[PDB]
Enzyme design. Structure first.
Site, short mmCIF file in Angstrom:
data_model
loop_
_atom_site.label_atom_id
_atom_site.label_comp_id
_atom_site.label_asym_id
_atom_site.label_seq_id
_atom_site.Cartn_x
_atom_site.Cartn_y
_atom_site.Cartn_z
N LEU A 21 0.84 -0.91 -0.18
CA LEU A 21 -0.18 0.43 -0.03
C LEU A 21 1.33 1.22 -0.17
O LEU A 21 0.51 1.96 -0.09
CB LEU A 21 -1.71 -0.27 1.07
CG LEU A 21 -2.15 -1.08 0.67
CD1 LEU A 21 -2.53 -1.22 2.63
CD2 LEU A 21 -3.49 -0.56 0.07
N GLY A 22 1.77 1.69 0.73
CA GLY A 22 2.61 2.27 1.05
C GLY A 22 4.23 2.03 0.96
O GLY A 22 4.54 1.66 2.00
N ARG A 23 4.90 2.99 1.62
CA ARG A 23 6.27 3.69 2.57
C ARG A 23 5.97 4.00 3.75
O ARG A 23 4.61 4.23 4.26
CB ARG A 23 7.28 3.92 1.49
N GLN A 24 7.42 -0.46 5.29
CA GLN A 24 6.70 -0.94 4.31
C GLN A 24 5.54 -0.67 5.27
O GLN A 24 5.10 -2.07 5.53
CB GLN A 24 7.29 -2.26 3.65
CG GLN A 24 6.72 -1.97 2.37
CD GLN A 24 6.93 -3.21 1.48
OE1 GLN A 24 7.82 -3.97 2.38
NE2 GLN A 24 6.83 -3.17 0.47
N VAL A 25 4.11 -0.69 4.01
CA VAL A 25 2.63 -0.89 4.23
C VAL A 25 2.22 -1.47 3.43
O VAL A 25 1.97 -1.36 2.44
CB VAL A 25 1.77 -0.07 4.53
CG1 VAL A 25 0.78 0.25 5.43
CG2 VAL A 25 2.12 1.45 6.16
N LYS A 45 1.94 -3.02 8.63
CA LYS A 45 3.18 -1.80 8.64
C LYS A 45 4.59 -3.04 9.23
O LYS A 45 3.81 -3.36 10.22
CB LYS A 45 2.60 -0.58 9.30
CG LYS A 45 3.67 0.33 9.81
CD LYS A 45 4.15 1.55 10.24
CE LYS A 45 3.80 2.47 9.47
NZ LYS A 45 3.59 4.05 10.21
N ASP A 142 -1.74 16.44 11.74
CA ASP A 142 -2.02 16.46 10.54
C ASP A 142 -3.61 16.48 9.70
O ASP A 142 -3.17 15.01 9.07
CB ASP A 142 -0.28 15.82 9.97
CG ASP A 142 -0.42 15.57 8.79
OD1 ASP A 142 -0.39 16.26 7.93
OD2 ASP A 142 0.49 14.22 8.31
#
Ligand SMILES: CCS(=O)(=O)c1ccc(OC)c(Nc2ncc(-c3cccc(-c4ccccn4)c3)o2)c1
Length: 261
Positions: A21-23, A24-25, A45, A142
């Site tokens: 899914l992204g930066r 590791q996930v 994660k 955020d």
């Protein structure tokens, strides 16, 4: 902080890793993670001491915070020696709210289309999520539509783990408080009711932007807002943090707008 393995530890051999899914996930299929005999897609994660520390910290904070429908909840963890450190959380199939709303720009009508009901609903849910986080004495810092994920059945969840979203006192005094999150929440509202636009369109974010912001300049109403929703944005953007609504007040108010809609 303590880690109760009995409560949270999940066997690595019941996790089948899938697409990143992204930066590791990564996406993974977990068998029995909620104690039923089911396969569920989850988000994992995974992993220096510094970095091991940061991920453990995140795990312990998610545990400290505890469960709410409108946050991305902890499901489990793989911390035992003999494999990577992994933190397992709820998977939100539709991804982030900003990218999603942008994709529905031509599939929106006020009254599978999005409607005002949907946008006010998402707004209400985020406020409930934030009311929850505030009661656990957290500050998000955020709070932006990119950090809200969309799950099934129109459930939105805050990720608990950019000058355009910052309260004036945060820029000028480095102050992050729950009332500065209320400011950010107003920007998030704008993002919702613009269906995923960037705030302050075409405006260069410099010393002059900051000046005008301290002085009282605000975004104009976004394209899909109701006047009540724009008023709420203005309220969240009060210059005096103490005169902004609280998250409890926003929940009550958005609940009334939703129920009225
Ligand atoms: C990773 C970018 S995203 O947040 O937009 C996103 C994209 C696609 C998705 O599913 C198809 C999801 N779904 C999702 N469920 C849980 C999570 C999750 C949990 C922890 C961290 C992150 C993450 C990873 C990299 C960057 C930002 N957030 C995502 O993402 C999110």
């Amino acid at each position: 902080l303590p880690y109760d393995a009995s409560k949270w530890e999940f066997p690595r051999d019941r996790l089948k890793l899938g697409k990143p899914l992204g930066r590791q996930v990564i996406e993974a299929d977990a068998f029995g993670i909620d104690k039923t005999a089911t396969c569920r897609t989850v988000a994992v994660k995974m992993l220096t001491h510094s970095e091991h520390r940061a991920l453990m910290s995140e795990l312990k904070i998610l545990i400290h915070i505890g469960h709410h429908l409108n946050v991305v909840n902890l499901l489990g963890a793989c911390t035992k020696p003999g494999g990577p450190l992994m933190v397992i959380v709820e998977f939100c199939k539709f991804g982030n709210l900003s990218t999603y709303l942008r994709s529905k720009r031509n599939e929106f009508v006020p009254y599978d289309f999005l409607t005002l009901e949907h946008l006010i609903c998402y707004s209400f849910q985020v406020a409930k999520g934030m009311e929850f986080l505030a009661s656990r004495k957290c500050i998000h810092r955020d709070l932006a539509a990119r950090n809200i994920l969309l799950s099934e059945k129109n459930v939105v969840k805050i990720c608990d783990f950019p000058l355009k979203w910052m309260a004036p006192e945060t820029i000028f005094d480095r102050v992050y408080t729950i009332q500065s999150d209320v400011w950010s929440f107003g920007v998030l509202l704008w993002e919702i009711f613009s269906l995923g636009a960037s705030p302050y369109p075409g405006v260069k974010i410099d010393e002059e932007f900051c000046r005008r912001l301290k002085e009282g300049t605000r975004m104009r109403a976004p394209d899909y807002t109701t006047p009540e929703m724009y008023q709420t944005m203005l309220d969240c953007w009060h210059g005096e943090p103490s005169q902004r609504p609280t998250f409890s007040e926003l929940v009550e108010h958005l609940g009334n707008l939703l129920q009225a809609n």
